[PDB]
Symmetry: C3
């Protein structure tokens, strides 16, 4: 039975080799500039219409990578002390695209992620206070703010602020932060479920499209 341990790690070595090759020869659906430019084009429109225009345009540029209307949903997000709402459009293990914002405004912890996040503002104001500094910056509609991996900032959204968010990195690691307050502060298990389901729907889509 000692040889069975060798066979166990034999196929384990090959499978891990298959995965490694796949993770490295994998390409991305979206470009950072692509998402930013679309949002910048629509920022002058009311956010409701801007959202609709952007979703339609994303679907024609990348069919089979954007969730259907039947699976689009606004779900509150409580994390880092702030509160907003998001609508997931695309979600894989390496990328996501979502609409985010708040009608009341909010402040808190940007989060510390294993990913690069790009927020292009559609309406309102985004205040950013970078770690190590004692001054803040403000971004306005049409402008894109990037959150590098391992960076942590204090953020503030003004009343009625909305943005398109494009994330790239280890996406399942971001859920730990995004659902923290939901678990320990709001106890909103229903919201917790809606979030996980939306991610599942996004993963479901990307899997079928890749398989056709």
């Amino acid at each position: 039975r000692w040889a069975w341990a060798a066979l166990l790690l034999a196929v384990a070595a090959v499978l891990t080799q298959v995965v490694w090759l796949w993770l490295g020869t994998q390409s991305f659906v979206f470009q950072r500039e692509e998402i930013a430019q679309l949002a910048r084009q629509y920022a002058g429109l009311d956010h409701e219409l801007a959202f609709s225009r952007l979703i339609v345009e994303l679907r024609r540029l990348h069919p089979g990578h954007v969730l259907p209307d039947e699976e689009l949903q606004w779900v509150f997000v409580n994390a880092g002390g702030w509160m907003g709402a998001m609508c997931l459009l695309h979600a894989s293990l390496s990328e996501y695209v979502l609409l985010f914002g708040t009608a009341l405004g909010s402040r808190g912890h940007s989060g510390r992620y294993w990913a690069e996040i790009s927020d292009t503002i559609i309406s309102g104001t985004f205040h950013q206070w970078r770690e190590g500094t004692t001054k803040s910056e403000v971004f306005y509609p049409g402008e894109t703010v990037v959150h590098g991996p391992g960076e942590a900032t204090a953020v503030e959204w003004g009343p009625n602020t909305w943005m398109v968010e494009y994330g790239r990195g280890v996406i399942p690691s971001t859920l730990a932060f995004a659902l923290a307050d939901t678990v320990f502060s709001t106890q909103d298990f229903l919201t917790l479920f809606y979030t996980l389901r939306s991610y599942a729907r996004g993963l479901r889509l990307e899997l079928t499209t890749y398989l056709f």
Copy 2:
């Protein structure tokens, strides 16, 4: 002996009778569900004092609430402002009535606050005496603002983002599984503020409210 009845059978028949009767009169306890306050009574009552400053408005409301419902309102000896930290927001409450199905309290903030309203197994109504109440309902990308005199109604299972301006005060009425709602109102107190003295104060106010509702029921 065609009219006679065996004693053993009759004894077991009556046991089935009391069992059938009890299991049915137990059900009517939910049918004879009596709430101490009417659903829109608290709102209609506080809408009258909204013109005053919150300090006098509270005192005159508490007095009026006692006269209308004697033995259902906590005495001045057990009235206390305690902080409330939940859903990312912070305020202070003053419990006036508390049972297992109902509660009435004075709530507000002198600074203002924002956060998650909470999903309760209950129906909550808030009537504004002073300040502003902002509500952002789930699924929408817009908010509504409520002014003094108006009443915000929060149905069961609903979740909204809330914002109170500076110096907003309100009376609050809740109907439903009150102990479960208490789990939310103490969440941030445990995992964010670690204010265990406040935790004690809140639970004590509930115990005082419950003690009153049983000593009134017993006398």
Copy 3:
């Protein structure tokens, strides 16, 4: 010579350790010494209030080092680290820290609101710039503090606090300092999950303790 009971000597020793510990603690309280006087930091920080906070901080650190050599952290150990607690967020720079005292620079560029924390310590905050709103427990009014003013937070007290944008202050603390850190890291553990920040904070404390340990032992 005689024997003592298994419950007799047990109680006697329980009184013996009671006699020792109580007079040992009282001995400990008597030898207690503080590097900074109760109102020393406040008096010193107010002198630099009104200036650009960068300039005020730099001059203060130089002044503290000159007044208390061996009790202020070197430049290579000074570090701005985010603080998340009680619902609010800001940044701190630890200047001095032991088991009984601490001095730190604190503030926020964005502003913030939340629970002040209920500490086993006496904490004073002298404002260099910006605004400090305080809402005391049991009250329905709030007081605003402007630069040059000092806010004192007594042990066991709990307030709601609000900082305006670009508010900066100097904070001195006196009491059970390790218990205070527990609060300061509450949101970091259960809300932000920022382990890096958590590590930075604990490292800042360790550096303060090390410096205090060396100065105590070797001058």
